[PDB]
Amino acid sequence: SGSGMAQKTWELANNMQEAQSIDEIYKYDKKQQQEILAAKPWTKDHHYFKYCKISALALLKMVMHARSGGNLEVMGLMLGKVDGETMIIMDSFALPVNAQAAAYEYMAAYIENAKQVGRLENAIGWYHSHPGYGCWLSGIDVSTQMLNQQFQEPFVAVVIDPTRKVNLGAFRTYPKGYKPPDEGPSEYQTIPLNKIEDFGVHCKQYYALEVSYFKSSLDRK
Ligand SMILES: CC(C)n1nc(C(F)F)cc1C(=O)Nc1ccc([C@H]2[C@@H](O)CCCc3cncn32)c(-c2ccccc2)c1
Ligand SMILES: [Zn+2]
């Protein structure tokens, strides 16, 4: 008696509670992110971030963009958030002259599209390709990333080599005059003879993050 109507109400409650849960999670993440962004712990610690988690969707798009330029470098922006000492990359868009108002109004639509599905994301970094020479930061890249870790902070620098298999680097520059300890050659990389000087010179002015990869519930399509 009322068995059929009970099933419908139970389905409806299940759906209504999912939406409410999604909204609660988004709101908790938003306030938790506004907390750290106002706190700015990365301004005091120079080895703060240690991990970089990249979504399979963001990697797909970045690698696709990287490949499309062939022998020529390519660049774009990355969407994500902070989670303690980890930089999470969830999505990315290619770049791209009056002004870069397009790069600013693209960014807003991505954040907004993600908000709908209850995803909290904002500009977390920039990516670019080194077709054939490896993952590291050129002298010009180190100047770029030092400025980014001043005006765009928190901001990560991703470098993809689409020619040579998973050849990606996630990096953070150290501040001007910061002398750190330890050794950082990590994984060996064969870079050309016409780049080794620029490499070796600047290879101490930044560090590598421990890259990890993930497939989200939404990134399964
Ligand atoms: C974060 C981005 C938008 N950005 N912000 C700021 C400013 F805030 F400082 C400044 C920037 C920014 O365009 N940097 C930049 C610097 C150098 C290159 C080229 C340059 O050397 C030429 C040799 C090849 C190269 C290998 N690695 C970097 N390059 C690029 C760049 C990379 C790929 C495609 C197009 C351009 C961007
Ligand atoms: Zn570069």
Short mmCIF file of all heavy atoms in Angstrom, two decimals, residues 15-38:
data_model
loop_
_atom_site.label_atom_id
_atom_site.label_comp_id
_atom_site.label_asym_id
_atom_site.label_seq_id
_atom_site.Cartn_x
_atom_site.Cartn_y
_atom_site.Cartn_z
N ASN A 15 18.04 11.84 -5.19
CA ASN A 15 18.47 12.88 -6.13
C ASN A 15 18.62 14.23 -5.46
O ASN A 15 19.67 14.86 -5.63
CB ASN A 15 17.54 12.96 -7.36
CG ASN A 15 17.40 11.66 -8.13
OD1 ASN A 15 18.27 10.78 -8.12
ND2 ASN A 15 16.26 11.50 -8.81
N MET A 16 17.60 14.68 -4.68
CA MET A 16 17.63 15.96 -3.97
C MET A 16 18.79 16.02 -2.98
O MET A 16 19.44 17.06 -2.90
CB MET A 16 16.31 16.24 -3.23
CG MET A 16 15.14 16.54 -4.15
SD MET A 16 13.58 16.68 -3.23
CE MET A 16 13.79 18.31 -2.47
N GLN A 17 19.08 14.90 -2.27
CA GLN A 17 20.20 14.88 -1.32
C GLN A 17 21.57 14.93 -2.04
O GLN A 17 22.47 15.61 -1.54
CB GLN A 17 20.11 13.74 -0.29
CG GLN A 17 21.16 13.80 0.83
CD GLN A 17 21.31 15.16 1.49
OE1 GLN A 17 20.33 15.82 1.87
NE2 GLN A 17 22.56 15.62 1.64
N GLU A 18 21.70 14.31 -3.24
CA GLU A 18 22.95 14.40 -4.03
C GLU A 18 23.28 15.87 -4.41
O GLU A 18 24.39 16.31 -4.13
CB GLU A 18 22.90 13.51 -5.28
CG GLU A 18 24.28 13.03 -5.70
CD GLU A 18 24.41 12.34 -7.06
OE1 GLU A 18 23.42 12.32 -7.83
OE2 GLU A 18 25.52 11.85 -7.36
N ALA A 19 22.31 16.62 -4.96
CA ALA A 19 22.44 18.03 -5.34
C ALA A 19 22.90 18.89 -4.17
O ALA A 19 23.87 19.64 -4.30
CB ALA A 19 21.12 18.56 -5.87
N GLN A 20 22.22 18.75 -3.03
CA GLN A 20 22.47 19.41 -1.74
C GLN A 20 23.90 19.07 -1.23
O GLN A 20 24.61 19.97 -0.78
CB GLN A 20 21.38 18.96 -0.75
CG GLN A 20 21.71 19.09 0.72
CD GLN A 20 20.84 20.10 1.36
OE1 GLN A 20 19.61 19.93 1.46
NE2 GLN A 20 21.45 21.19 1.82
N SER A 21 24.30 17.79 -1.33
CA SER A 21 25.64 17.32 -0.95
C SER A 21 26.69 17.98 -1.84
O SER A 21 27.70 18.46 -1.32
CB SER A 21 25.73 15.80 -1.08
OG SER A 21 27.07 15.36 -1.19
N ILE A 22 26.44 18.03 -3.17
CA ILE A 22 27.33 18.64 -4.15
C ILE A 22 27.53 20.11 -3.81
O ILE A 22 28.67 20.54 -3.68
CB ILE A 22 26.86 18.39 -5.60
CG1 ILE A 22 27.14 16.91 -6.02
CG2 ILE A 22 27.50 19.38 -6.60
CD1 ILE A 22 26.21 16.36 -7.14
N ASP A 23 26.43 20.84 -3.57
CA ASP A 23 26.46 22.25 -3.20
C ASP A 23 27.21 22.48 -1.90
O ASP A 23 27.99 23.42 -1.83
CB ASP A 23 25.06 22.86 -3.17
CG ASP A 23 25.07 24.35 -2.94
OD1 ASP A 23 25.34 25.10 -3.92
OD2 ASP A 23 24.87 24.78 -1.78
N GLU A 24 26.99 21.63 -0.88
CA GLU A 24 27.69 21.70 0.41
C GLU A 24 29.20 21.52 0.23
O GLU A 24 29.98 22.20 0.90
CB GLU A 24 27.19 20.59 1.35
CG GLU A 24 25.95 20.89 2.18
CD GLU A 24 25.37 19.66 2.87
OE1 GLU A 24 26.15 18.80 3.34
OE2 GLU A 24 24.12 19.55 2.92
N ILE A 25 29.61 20.55 -0.63
CA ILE A 25 31.03 20.23 -0.88
C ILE A 25 31.72 21.40 -1.59
O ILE A 25 32.81 21.81 -1.19
CB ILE A 25 31.22 18.87 -1.61
CG1 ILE A 25 30.74 17.68 -0.73
CG2 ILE A 25 32.70 18.67 -2.04
CD1 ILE A 25 30.63 16.32 -1.49
N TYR A 26 31.05 21.96 -2.62
CA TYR A 26 31.54 23.11 -3.36
C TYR A 26 31.80 24.27 -2.41
O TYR A 26 32.87 24.87 -2.46
CB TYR A 26 30.54 23.53 -4.45
CG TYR A 26 30.95 24.82 -5.12
CD1 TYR A 26 31.96 24.84 -6.08
CD2 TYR A 26 30.36 26.03 -4.77
CE1 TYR A 26 32.35 26.03 -6.70
CE2 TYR A 26 30.76 27.23 -5.36
CZ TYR A 26 31.76 27.23 -6.33
OH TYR A 26 32.14 28.40 -6.92
N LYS A 27 30.81 24.59 -1.56
CA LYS A 27 30.85 25.68 -0.60
C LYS A 27 31.94 25.49 0.46
O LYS A 27 32.64 26.45 0.79
CB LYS A 27 29.45 25.93 0.01
CG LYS A 27 28.44 26.49 -1.03
CD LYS A 27 27.10 26.93 -0.41
CE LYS A 27 26.31 27.77 -1.39
NZ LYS A 27 25.29 28.62 -0.73
N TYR A 28 32.13 24.24 0.94
CA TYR A 28 33.19 23.91 1.90
C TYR A 28 34.56 24.12 1.22
O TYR A 28 35.42 24.80 1.80
CB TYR A 28 33.04 22.46 2.40
CG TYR A 28 34.15 22.00 3.34
CD1 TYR A 28 34.23 22.46 4.65
CD2 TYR A 28 35.10 21.07 2.92
CE1 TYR A 28 35.24 22.03 5.51
CE2 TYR A 28 36.10 20.62 3.77
CZ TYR A 28 36.17 21.10 5.07
OH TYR A 28 37.16 20.65 5.92
N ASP A 29 34.74 23.60 -0.02
CA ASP A 29 35.97 23.77 -0.82
C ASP A 29 36.26 25.25 -1.08
O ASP A 29 37.39 25.68 -0.87
CB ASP A 29 35.89 23.00 -2.14
CG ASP A 29 36.03 21.49 -2.00
OD1 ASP A 29 36.35 21.02 -0.89
OD2 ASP A 29 35.82 20.78 -3.02
N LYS A 30 35.23 26.03 -1.50
CA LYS A 30 35.36 27.46 -1.74
C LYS A 30 35.93 28.19 -0.51
O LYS A 30 36.93 28.89 -0.65
CB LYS A 30 34.03 28.09 -2.16
CG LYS A 30 34.15 29.57 -2.50
CD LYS A 30 32.82 30.26 -2.66
CE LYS A 30 33.02 31.72 -2.98
NZ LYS A 30 31.74 32.48 -2.95
N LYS A 31 35.31 28.00 0.68
CA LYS A 31 35.75 28.66 1.92
C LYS A 31 37.11 28.14 2.38
O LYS A 31 37.90 28.92 2.89
CB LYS A 31 34.67 28.61 3.05
CG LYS A 31 34.71 27.42 4.02
CD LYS A 31 35.25 27.80 5.41
CE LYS A 31 35.28 26.63 6.37
NZ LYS A 31 35.89 26.99 7.67
N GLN A 32 37.39 26.85 2.16
CA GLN A 32 38.68 26.25 2.51
C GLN A 32 39.80 26.81 1.60
O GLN A 32 40.93 26.93 2.05
CB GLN A 32 38.59 24.72 2.39
CG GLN A 32 39.77 23.94 2.96
CD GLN A 32 39.35 22.54 3.35
OE1 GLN A 32 39.16 22.24 4.54
NE2 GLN A 32 39.18 21.66 2.37
N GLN A 33 39.46 27.15 0.34
CA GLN A 33 40.39 27.70 -0.64
C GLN A 33 40.61 29.19 -0.36
O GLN A 33 41.76 29.64 -0.38
CB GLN A 33 39.89 27.44 -2.08
CG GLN A 33 40.96 27.46 -3.19
CD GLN A 33 42.10 26.46 -3.12
OE1 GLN A 33 43.17 26.69 -3.69
NE2 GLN A 33 41.92 25.30 -2.52
N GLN A 34 39.53 29.94 -0.03
CA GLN A 34 39.62 31.36 0.34
C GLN A 34 40.46 31.54 1.63
O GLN A 34 41.13 32.57 1.79
CB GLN A 34 38.23 31.96 0.54
CG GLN A 34 37.43 32.12 -0.73
CD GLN A 34 36.02 32.58 -0.45
OE1 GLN A 34 35.38 32.18 0.53
NE2 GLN A 34 35.49 33.43 -1.34
N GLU A 35 40.45 30.50 2.51
CA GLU A 35 41.23 30.46 3.73
C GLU A 35 42.70 30.53 3.36
O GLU A 35 43.34 31.54 3.68
CB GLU A 35 40.96 29.17 4.55
CG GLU A 35 39.84 29.27 5.57
CD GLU A 35 39.57 28.02 6.40
OE1 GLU A 35 39.38 26.93 5.80
OE2 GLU A 35 39.50 28.13 7.64
N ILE A 36 43.22 29.49 2.66
CA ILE A 36 44.63 29.38 2.28
C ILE A 36 45.09 30.56 1.40
O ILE A 36 46.14 31.12 1.67
CB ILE A 36 45.00 28.01 1.68
CG1 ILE A 36 44.17 26.87 2.31
CG2 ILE A 36 46.48 27.74 1.90
CD1 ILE A 36 44.09 25.50 1.44
N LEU A 37 44.26 30.99 0.42
CA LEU A 37 44.57 32.13 -0.46
C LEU A 37 44.78 33.46 0.28
O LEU A 37 45.55 34.31 -0.19
CB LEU A 37 43.51 32.31 -1.55
CG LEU A 37 43.40 31.23 -2.65
CD1 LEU A 37 42.12 31.43 -3.48
CD2 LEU A 37 44.64 31.18 -3.54
N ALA A 38 44.07 33.67 1.41
CA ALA A 38 44.20 34.85 2.27
C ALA A 38 45.39 34.65 3.24
O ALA A 38 46.07 35.63 3.57
CB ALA A 38 42.91 35.10 3.03
#
